[PDB]
């Protein structure tokens, strides 16, 4: 029973086109070559869906370093003192505070410095 191949093909044509909506030039017009960049753009989606966490943690660390230096301490020392004091706050909250409440950031850095041992070069 010969089946005429119209509706099925058009469904997927339109679905791919819609998913490609908003691309450049003919790339949102020609299905034979929208597929190329639907597939690509989604490959990038897959990869950066994790790349984003790395990038954001990088930005947070940079902001924290800036805040620590403005408060006269280096980021690594801030982290070391904070850990040695056994705080459980992470760098996302660190950065958000550092840009929101400099007073609280100052208090936290004092806590870190106080928890910082006397000698930093001790072999023990």
Which residues within the stretch 85-104 sit at the binding site for RNA (CB under 7 A)?
A: 90-92
What is d(CA 52, CA 88) in angstroms, rounded to the nearest whole number? 23
SS3 content of the chain, % helix, strand, coil (to 5): 75, 0, 25
Residue 7 interacts with RNA (CB under 7 A)?
yes
Nearest residue (CB) to RNA, 50 versus 86: 50
95 CB neighbour count, 10 Å cutoff: 22
Residue 76 interacts with RNA (CB under 7 A)?
yes
The residues that touch RNA, with contacts defined as CB under 7 A, are 1-15, 18, 21-33, 35-37, 39-41, 44-58, 61-62, 65, 74-77, 79-80, 83, 90-92, 120-121, 123
């Amino acid at each position: 029973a010969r089946v005429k191949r119209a509706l099925n093909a058009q469904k997927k044509r339109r679905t791919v086109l819609k998913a490609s909506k908003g691309y450049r030039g003919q790339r949102s017009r020609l299905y034979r070559k929208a597929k190329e960049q639907q597939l690509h753009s989604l490959t990038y989606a897959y990869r950066d869906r994790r790349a984003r966490k790395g990038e954001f943690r990088k930005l947070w660390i940079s902001r924290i370093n800036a805040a620590a230096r403005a408060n006269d301490i280096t980021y690594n020392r801030l982290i070391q003192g904070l850990k040695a004091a056994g705080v459980e706050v992470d760098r996302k909250n660190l950065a958000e505070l550092a840009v929101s409440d400099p007073a609280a950031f100052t208090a936290l850095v004092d806590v870190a410095r106080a928890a910082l041992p006397e000698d930093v070069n001790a072999p023990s």
